[PDB]
Design a binder for this molecule. Sequence first.
Ligand SMILES: COc1c(NC(=O)N2CCC[C@H](C(N)=O)C2)cccc1C(F)(F)F
Ligand SMILES: [Zn+2]
Length: 139
Amino acid sequence: SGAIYVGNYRVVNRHLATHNDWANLVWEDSSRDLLVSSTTAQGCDTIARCDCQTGVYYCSSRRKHYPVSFSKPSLIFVEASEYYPARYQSHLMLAVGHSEPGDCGGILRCQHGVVGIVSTGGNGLVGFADVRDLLWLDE
Ligand SMILES: COc1c(NC(=O)N2CCC[C@H](C(N)=O)C2)cccc1C(F)(F)F
Ligand SMILES: [Zn+2]
C-alpha cells in the first residue's frame, strides 16, 4: 500500500484504488497501473523533474529503505494477475531489489523528489511506475 500526495491530488496504484478514489477520479491509465484522485487537503509531497536512474525506495515487507539503480521508463511485458490480463505495462522502470505484492505503493525518490511508486516485482526484481512525466500534478 501507499500513495503520493501532491497539491490536491492523490496518486495510487490503479489496482489498489478505493471506492472513494474512483468517486473523485481525475485520471487513470490501466496500461500504467496509475490512478489519480482529487483531495480536499493540501498534500505533503514534491515530484522530481529529472532523468535520475538511481534512488531509494521504501519496502514495506522489510520495513526498510533500499538504494537502487533502475532502468529508464519503458514498455515491459507483465504476466496476467487477478487485476489485469497479460499485457505490456508502459512507463515502467525495473531494478534489482526485494518486493512482494503488498509492497505496491511504496515511494521511489531521488534527491529531486518523488520519482514513482512500486507497481510490479518478483524473483529479486522490483518495478516502479514513473510519475515524472505527469507535469500537470504540479498545477
Ligand atoms: C508476481 O507477483 C509479485 C508481484 N505482483 C505483481 O507484480 N503484480 C500483481 C499486482 C499488479 C501488478 C501490475 N502492475 O500489473 C503485477 C509484486 C511483487 C512480487 C511478486 C512476487 F514476488 F510474488 F512474484
Ligand atoms: Zn532526480
